[PDB]
Design a protein around this ligand. Structure first.
Ligand SMILES: SC[C@H]1SC[C@@H]2Nc3ccccc3N21
Ligand SMILES: [Zn+2]
Ligand SMILES: [Zn+2]
Length: 228
């Protein structure tokens, strides 16, 4: 917890820019483990990146949005099929929110014990989302960097800001380690591809660290170089 953070139930919210917030939820494992996602205000609507670990926690994200922003949530995008990112899908579907994930994330979801998203994103060979599969994503710029943390992991830049979201692919520059589902061969190149896709992002948001500078990307890639 840090100055300027807002506690709402057992969740924490931090404003990162005029129209961007980080949501943080916690699961006991080892102690409490944090997972971060994003909330974006885009005109008269709100966009969400990643659920919380659980449905009840994700419901509280929606309650916080109602109180602090009071705009309808148009869509949510989730960045791979693990519990921290997709554990709360039912809360979104119960609320009528359109949900999006990598097609591979939706294909893996049943095996991972997750509820698949309603819609599937596909990607070009250069990693950029096929625009037809990302309808009305507004400032959310979705990029598939290649296999790393998982084979399905995706990343999201926030257009009009200096923020890019690396999900669980990127760790901060103080991390000592990065891998059960991981592609250790391609991880380093995937980390570097994320950096090259969002070359002007100066605030890197990630799932299990507080926001960091671009050094988080390079430090992560150099740690991943050692896995090969
Ligand atoms: S990246 C998916 C999440 S869900 C359970 C597993 N173990 C773990 C431990 C610490 C941080 C994150 C994690 N992961
Ligand atoms: Zn994961
Ligand atoms: Zn994670």
């Amino acid at each position: 917890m840090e100055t300027g953070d807002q506690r709402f139930g057992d969740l924490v919210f931090r404003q990162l820019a005029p129209n961007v917030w980080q949501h943080t939820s916690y699961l006991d494992m080892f102690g409490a483990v944090a997972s971060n996602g994003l909330i974006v205000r885009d005109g008269g609507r709100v966009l969400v990146v990643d659920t919380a670990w659980t449905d009840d926690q994700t419901a509280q994200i929606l309650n916080w949005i109602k109180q602090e922003i009071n705009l309808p949530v148009a869509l949510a995008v989730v960045t791979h099929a693990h519990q921290d990112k997709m554990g709360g899908m039912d809360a979104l579907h119960a609320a009528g929110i359109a949900t999006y994930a990598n097609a591979l994330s939706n294909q893996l979801a049943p095996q991972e014990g997750m509820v698949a998203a309603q819609h599937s994103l596909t990607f070009a060979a250069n990693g950029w989302v096929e625009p037809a599969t990302a309808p009305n994503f507004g400032p959310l710029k979705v990029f598939y960097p290649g296999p790393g943390h998982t084979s399905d992991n995706i990343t999201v830049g926030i257009d009009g800001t200096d923020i890019a979201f690396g999900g669980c692919l990127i760790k901060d520059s103080k991390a000592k380690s990065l891998l059960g589902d991981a592609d250790t061969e391609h991880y380093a190149a995937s980390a570097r591809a994320f950096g090259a896709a969002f070359p002007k992002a100066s605030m890197i948001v990630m799932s299990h660290s507080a926001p960091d500078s671009r050094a988080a990307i390079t430090h992560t890639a150099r740690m991943a170089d050692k896995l090969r």
